[PDB]
Design a protein around this motif. Structure first.
Motif, PDB file in Angstrom:
ATOM      1  N   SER A 197     137.862   5.352 141.634  1.00 39.18           N
ATOM      2  CA  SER A 197     136.757   5.916 143.307  1.00 39.18           C
ATOM      3  C   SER A 197     135.683   6.355 142.894  1.00 39.18           C
ATOM      4  O   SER A 197     134.751   5.787 143.894  1.00 39.18           O
ATOM      5  CB  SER A 197     138.056   7.016 144.651  1.00 39.18           C
ATOM      6  OG  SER A 197     138.082   8.104 143.890  1.00 39.18           O
ATOM      7  N   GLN A 198     135.365   6.801 141.390  1.00 34.63           N
ATOM      8  CA  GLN A 198     134.483   7.466 141.953  1.00 34.63           C
ATOM      9  C   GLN A 198     133.403   5.860 140.717  1.00 34.63           C
ATOM     10  O   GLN A 198     132.360   5.954 141.051  1.00 34.63           O
ATOM     11  CB  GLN A 198     134.485   8.703 140.205  1.00 34.63           C
ATOM     12  CG  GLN A 198     135.747   7.178 139.123  1.00 34.63           C
ATOM     13  CD  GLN A 198     136.644   8.580 138.571  1.00 34.63           C
ATOM     14  OE1 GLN A 198     136.930   9.097 139.632  1.00 34.63           O
ATOM     15  NE2 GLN A 198     137.194   8.318 137.998  1.00 34.63           N
ATOM     16  N   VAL A 233     138.084   8.466 149.692  1.00 36.94           N
ATOM     17  CA  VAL A 233     137.372   7.069 149.271  1.00 36.94           C
ATOM     18  C   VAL A 233     139.082   6.656 148.351  1.00 36.94           C
ATOM     19  O   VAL A 233     139.228   7.714 147.736  1.00 36.94           O
ATOM     20  CB  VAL A 233     136.236   6.453 148.100  1.00 36.94           C
ATOM     21  CG1 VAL A 233     136.718   5.679 147.415  1.00 36.94           C
ATOM     22  CG2 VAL A 233     135.538   6.519 148.576  1.00 36.94           C
ATOM     23  N   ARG A 246     126.429   4.221 145.616  1.00 39.53           N
ATOM     24  CA  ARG A 246     125.004   4.661 145.890  1.00 39.53           C
ATOM     25  C   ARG A 246     124.230   4.516 145.613  1.00 39.53           C
ATOM     26  O   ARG A 246     122.865   4.911 146.135  1.00 39.53           O
ATOM     27  CB  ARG A 246     125.420   6.349 145.790  1.00 39.53           C
ATOM     28  CG  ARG A 246     124.778   7.339 145.621  1.00 39.53           C
ATOM     29  CD  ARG A 246     124.887   8.844 145.078  1.00 39.53           C
ATOM     30  NE  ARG A 246     124.562   9.064 144.010  1.00 39.53           N
ATOM     31  CZ  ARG A 246     124.067   9.475 143.690  1.00 39.53           C
ATOM     32  NH1 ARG A 246     123.372  10.945 144.769  1.00 39.53           N
ATOM     33  NH2 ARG A 246     122.922  10.586 141.983  1.00 39.53           N
ATOM     34  N   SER A 284     139.014  12.076 146.356  1.00 39.10           N
ATOM     35  CA  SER A 284     139.050  11.087 145.312  1.00 39.10           C
ATOM     36  C   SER A 284     140.115  10.471 145.119  1.00 39.10           C
ATOM     37  O   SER A 284     140.023   9.314 144.460  1.00 39.10           O
ATOM     38  CB  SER A 284     138.935  11.991 143.881  1.00 39.10           C
ATOM     39  OG  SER A 284     138.001  13.191 143.709  1.00 39.10           O
ATOM     40  N   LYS A 302     132.146   4.815 144.302  1.00 42.80           N
ATOM     41  CA  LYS A 302     131.184   5.406 144.890  1.00 42.80           C
ATOM     42  C   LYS A 302     130.214   5.459 143.882  1.00 42.80           C
ATOM     43  O   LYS A 302     128.726   5.850 145.290  1.00 42.80           O
ATOM     44  CB  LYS A 302     131.872   6.817 145.310  1.00 42.80           C
ATOM     45  CG  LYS A 302     132.903   7.496 146.214  1.00 42.80           C
ATOM     46  CD  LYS A 302     132.955   9.135 146.277  1.00 42.80           C
ATOM     47  CE  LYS A 302     134.569   9.303 146.302  1.00 42.80           C
ATOM     48  NZ  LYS A 302     134.919  10.948 146.778  1.00 42.80           N
ATOM     49  N   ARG A 303     129.905   5.067 142.621  1.00 44.90           N
ATOM     50  CA  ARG A 303     128.645   5.094 142.113  1.00 44.90           C
ATOM     51  C   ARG A 303     128.063   3.752 142.672  1.00 44.90           C
ATOM     52  O   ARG A 303     127.180   3.732 143.323  1.00 44.90           O
ATOM     53  CB  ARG A 303     129.601   5.674 141.053  1.00 44.90           C
ATOM     54  CG  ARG A 303     127.909   5.433 139.703  1.00 44.90           C
ATOM     55  CD  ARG A 303     127.537   6.208 139.044  1.00 44.90           C
ATOM     56  NE  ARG A 303     126.091   6.768 138.323  1.00 44.90           N
ATOM     57  CZ  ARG A 303     125.798   6.891 137.363  1.00 44.90           C
ATOM     58  NH1 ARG A 303     124.967   8.395 138.099  1.00 44.90           N
ATOM     59  NH2 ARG A 303     124.065   6.497 136.759  1.00 44.90           N
ATOM     60  N   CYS A 321     129.474  13.009 149.908  1.00 39.13           N
ATOM     61  CA  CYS A 321     129.854  13.097 148.342  1.00 39.13           C
ATOM     62  C   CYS A 321     130.362  15.025 148.189  1.00 39.13           C
ATOM     63  O   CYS A 321     131.574  15.394 147.984  1.00 39.13           O
ATOM     64  CB  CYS A 321     129.938  12.632 147.980  1.00 39.13           C
ATOM     65  SG  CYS A 321     129.999  10.477 147.236  1.00 39.13           S
ATOM     66  N   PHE A 379     138.789   3.096 152.579  1.00 33.23           N
ATOM     67  CA  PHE A 379     137.435   4.517 152.837  1.00 33.23           C
ATOM     68  C   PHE A 379     137.665   4.857 154.110  1.00 33.23           C
ATOM     69  O   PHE A 379     137.812   4.313 154.803  1.00 33.23           O
ATOM     70  CB  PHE A 379     135.431   3.447 153.375  1.00 33.23           C
ATOM     71  CG  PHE A 379     135.323   2.299 151.600  1.00 33.23           C
ATOM     72  CD1 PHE A 379     135.436   1.482 151.819  1.00 33.23           C
ATOM     73  CD2 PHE A 379     134.945   3.022 150.596  1.00 33.23           C
ATOM     74  CE1 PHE A 379     135.400   0.566 151.060  1.00 33.23           C
ATOM     75  CE2 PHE A 379     134.771   2.311 149.758  1.00 33.23           C
ATOM     76  CZ  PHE A 379     134.911   0.906 150.213  1.00 33.23           C
ATOM     77  N   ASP A 408     124.000  11.051 150.243  1.00 37.88           N
ATOM     78  CA  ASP A 408     124.115  11.245 149.709  1.00 37.88           C
ATOM     79  C   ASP A 408     124.828  12.362 149.374  1.00 37.88           C
ATOM     80  O   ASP A 408     126.426  12.188 149.040  1.00 37.88           O
ATOM     81  CB  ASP A 408     123.635  10.662 148.486  1.00 37.88           C
ATOM     82  CG  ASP A 408     122.201  11.467 148.154  1.00 37.88           C
ATOM     83  OD1 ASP A 408     121.978  12.069 149.190  1.00 37.88           O
ATOM     84  OD2 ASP A 408     122.377  11.101 146.863  1.00 37.88           O
ATOM     85  N   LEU A 457     133.636  11.763 153.013  1.00 35.45           N
ATOM     86  CA  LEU A 457     133.659  10.356 152.601  1.00 35.45           C
ATOM     87  C   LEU A 457     135.134  10.393 151.582  1.00 35.45           C
ATOM     88  O   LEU A 457     134.797  11.028 150.534  1.00 35.45           O
ATOM     89  CB  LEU A 457     132.923   9.593 152.208  1.00 35.45           C
ATOM     90  CG  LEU A 457     133.166   9.339 151.576  1.00 35.45           C
ATOM     91  CD1 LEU A 457     132.991   7.332 152.139  1.00 35.45           C
ATOM     92  CD2 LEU A 457     132.041   7.955 150.404  1.00 35.45           C
TER      93      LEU A 457
END
Lengths: 165, 371, 370, 372
Positions: free
Chosen positions: D39-40, D173, D47, C259, D43-44, D145, D219, D141, D171
């Motif tokens: 980073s979340q 990030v 996605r 993360s 990523k969302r 993740c 990334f 995905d 992955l």
């Protein structure tokens, strides 16, 4: 203790912009980031002029920063040791309880200048269990006279009384 | 004449000394809790150091029969040695007697000589054995630390009456208190399993304890009692003093040092020549707080300098002036930016400090006395 | 002789080492709060790295019976091995021994060989198992880290006699601490529900913690103890030292890196050869405060260099010379002084630095020990 | 073999990521205040993008009963379904479960079969549901993740065993950080009333916060781990890499875009292939101070190129060559100056860069891996 009540009420009356200003200043001094200095001076100075008593500057600064990070509804009868004992009672009595109790008992050893992170972990444990109240006035009054031995005695005794029942 | 050394040393987070429960040792000084290092820990860590190896001529052991056998080679005398050791009031509990015996390592050959031959009888040899342990005091470590040994009385041979088997200490070492408040910390550790299994759990879970502090060390050496302990060997006594200074400055206790490695050097040494011992531990009756304008070590050194000035001005005597040296690496830390007068000489090199100390002590040179 | 490696390394905002409460590990140094990385984290990250992959000789695990059964090939040799391990002082708890066992991987074949033999009684087989476990200490990681094993004597058979098991570790690692003061931060996250429902509320809601700081790491290697623990093979010791330096340069702890991904290479590596270990952690007793013109890493390197100069000029003796190598990527940062050089050879390369330290240590080459 | 993307992207004044109060997310890096996109959130945004629509297989929901009933089509199973979910370790709370379940959609219909079997025992149905939930990981995905899922055992069941439900992510990030100091700004707003009155006041008065910034994004993708996670499939892996590159190069977070609309494309992308993951975020430790002769993006790209060249020549390895691709639209920005050439190819188009990337992995073609 009316000055402390006015201080806490003025803290609740704050908007979100200066709350974010205080949130960005966690762990910092008072001599940098001038908007924080101006906001704290506006908060604390009128207390001394009218009320003869006033909370200490370091205690007031710590309380303001903790309130900014850990916004809690001020309610009479919700002192920190009582809530901590109520949380500690509903714990595993072999491993988690000694660790959390050690983190609580670390607090009654330092001065005001180093209580920020050891208090922030306590407020984080409180927020983990979804608290909605905290006695900021009683905590401020206790933190003011932190060098008197009966103050620490009553702090520990209240914690033990809430733990035992 | 007394040589007193006061040292200020800030340490990295470590656990150099701990009690039975694993917590670092603490004490109550001035009504405030401070971190402590026990004096015997410092004494042993100096004594068993690499820089003191040329002076280690004594062993404090519990198994003397094992040394007797290991120095006698191949001839079997281990039971016999155990018997004669039992006869002089030492008892025997499974190859180790009930008491520790302090004795110079040079005298094991003599004990082997008495234990090997069957020409002499048993009990008289036991008396002879006593006369070797009561006179095995010509060691630097025995001379420094001091020895007392009281043997038993319920199993003696009634003909083995002992001489004087004590040596007065020529070195006083204090407990290294901290200049500020105690801040104990808990390190929550886990120990994982190298082989994967069903769960995500690990092999072990525990907690250790550590703390970082600035310590005030105090040592005192009695030169007359030192040269009396070694029977007038002034050369060897000066060699011990110099090697002790080097080892004390350049060594740390080896407690949990494979996980913390707090190999920190002292940031200030004050060496004074006096006639009566004075301790500057009362410099920190008020604990040292932190201001942004300075740091912990500078504030501690300033407090020490202020108290040294107070002591010198309040206890000045024209009959006994005091000469002291202040040492800091490359003069990084002076004795406070207020007086510039409590240090008779400012030294920036440790070897020069040791040489000046030796020259004041007897006018010798270091390379002369190292052998 | 002692080989010391000091590193100044700046990291991205991450949470590389936590505690039971999920907060970054901290400490109190110089009277002020600092961010800390535990030494066990650094040692584990070094040990299981790609550069150390060819040297992973030892295994520390609780389920030794599974390894013995897997090496022995068949399946029925499981409960018997559990019985032998139970008679050796390792009480079992739900198909798992209480204590971890550290041993070289080459001797598991011998353990499978003895356990597979059915012609030998219980106690003597347990004695041979204990002997070969106690003598299985030939591995680079076991040599570096050391070993402890104290079997439970109250559960073992009285006829079992253990030989020596403790090994003296030939490596010291310090808890990495931040040069400047610590500034912990709280990250507010929610986990979003992926389908519509009745309310617009999310799934989970939480407050994680993270902090970014520039760390000072310290490692020390004892050459003679490493060679002695490796049974006198100097080539293995040289390969171990070189691979250890390469793995410590280019590997970071894996805690919450999915993360945060703070895969930052160190901006300063200094290597010294001297007979006594010393840590330069007192270079940062006063925290490094950033100014409007300079930066964090350059100020940290400057303060470390000043303290190194003070130590080298204050604790110098003719009877023990010191040779130091300083490494910065393509000489991005100088150390020795603003005008002087205290490192005997500045290196702008990592492989050249490894070759240089090997060539000083024995004239060895990276194309021979590897 | 690791494939890494390093992006420099300018952003006009916006509020892309917030917190409890409403302040833009900040962080400290190098002793100074920065602007951060978590980073979340990135990523969302990747996605649920348009370029990742063809690969969105998995779903992370607390409403598995509703999806089961929707795939079934009959009413009375739904309540029964939640009872099944109470025996696998998902204690319900106010019409939905207490924890999120992350699994592929293609196996959801099989879940329906379990609540379509009236002859099945309750414990046996719970065990089959647990097995099929544990085996539902064949989606790009979920492969990227990962997943951690821990059903509770306080009231779950007896003699019900859960298989291993854990996927290691392919992955990584990094949180974005501004390449300069952070200057937050406060916008005072009012809400005018549409109806005249006696006082001419406002309906509401308040504030908002915003900041413009030049961000660095990082990334990293492990090729072998992704291939292993995708059960040996390579065409779907190449499709995943290509769609990920196109989505991460052309999608922005959807936070307060109805009021700020900062849909800015990046002005530089570095795509690297190497055996170890490196992040060049240490380049901007000294904040970029703007001079009059240039702008924010040029100085940032120059500092990034300086650090990249110094790292490449400093950690140079012989038995591991480094191949790099540098992208800027129509070669608007090279790698600053003071260098001959650092990356192998300076590609001026995004789709040509994607084609070259797919060509490097063995020579796959974008249009034929579209078919996966």
């Amino acid at each position: 203790n009316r000055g402390t009540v006015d201080f806490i009420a003025s803290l609740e009356n704050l908007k979100e912009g200066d709350l974010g200003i205080l949130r960005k200043l966690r762990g910092a001094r008072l001599d940098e980031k001038l908007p924080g200095f101006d906001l704290f001076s506006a908060l604390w100075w009128p207390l001394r002029q009218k009320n003869q008593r006033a909370p200490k500057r370091e205690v007031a600064w710590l309380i303001a920063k903790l309130f900014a990070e850990f916004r809690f509804e001020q309610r009479e009868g919700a002192t920190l040791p009582i809530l901590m004992g109520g949380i500690c009672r509903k714990l595993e009595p072999k491993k988690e309880l000694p660790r959390v109790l050690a983190r609580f008992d670390q607090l009654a050893s330092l001065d005001i200048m180093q209580m920020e992170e050891p208090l922030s972990v306590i407020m984080g444990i409180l927020r983990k269990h979804q608290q909605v109240c905290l006695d900021w006035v009683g905590l401020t009054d206790v933190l003011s006279f932190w060098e008197q031995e009966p103050v620490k005695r009553e702090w520990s005794d209240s914690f033990i009384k809430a733990y035992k029942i | 004449m007394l040589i007193e050394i006061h040292m200020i040393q800030n340490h990295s987070p470590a656990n150099l000394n701990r009690d039975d429960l694993g917590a670092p040792k603490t004490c109550y000084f001035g009504g405030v809790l401070r971190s402590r290092i026990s004096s015997q820990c410092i004494k042993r860590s100096i004594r068993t150091s690499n820089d003191f190896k040329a002076l280690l001529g004594g062993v404090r052991t519990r198994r003397l029969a094992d040394l007797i056998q290991q120095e006698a080679g191949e001839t079997e005398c281990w039971k016999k040695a155990q018997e004669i050791l039992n006869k002089c009031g030492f008892k025997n509990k499974d190859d180790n007697t009930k008491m520790l015996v302090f004795m110079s390592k040079d005298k094991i050959k003599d004990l082997a000589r008495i234990v090997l031959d069957n020409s002499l009888g048993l009990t008289e040899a036991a008396q002879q054995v006593a006369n070797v342990i009561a006179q095995a005091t010509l060691a630097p470590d025995i001379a420094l630390c001091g020895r007392m040994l009281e043997p038993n009385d319920k199993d003696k041979d009634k003909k083995v009456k002992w001489s004087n088997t004590t040596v007065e200490a020529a070195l006083q070492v204090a407990h290294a208190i901290s200049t500020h408040i105690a801040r104990p910390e808990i390190d929550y550790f886990v120990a994982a399993d190298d082989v994967p299994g069903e769960d995500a759990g690990a092999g072990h879970i525990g907690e250790s304890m550590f703390a970082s502090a600035c310590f005030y060390k105090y040592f005192s050496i009695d030169w007359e009692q030192l040269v009396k302990n070694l029977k007038g060997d002034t050369n060897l006594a000066a060699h011990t003093v110099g090697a002790f200074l080097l080892a004390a400055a350049k060594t740390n206790p080896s407690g949990k040092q494979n996980s913390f490695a707090a190999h920190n050097y002292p940031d200030g040494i004050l060496v004074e020549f006096k006639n009566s011992p004075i301790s500057y531990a009362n410099a920190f009756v008020r604990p040292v707080s932190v201001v942004k304008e300075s740091d912990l070590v500078e504030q501690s050194i300033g407090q020490l300098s202020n108290y040294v000035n107070d002591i010198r001005l309040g206890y000045y005597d024209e009959q006994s002036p005091v000469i002291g040296f202040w040492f800091s690496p490359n003069n990084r830390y002076p004795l406070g930016y207020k007086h510039s007068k409590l240090a008779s000489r400012n030294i920036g090199n440790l070897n020069e400090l040791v040489g000046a100390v030796l020259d004041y002590i007897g006018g010798f040179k270091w390379e002369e006395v190292q052998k």
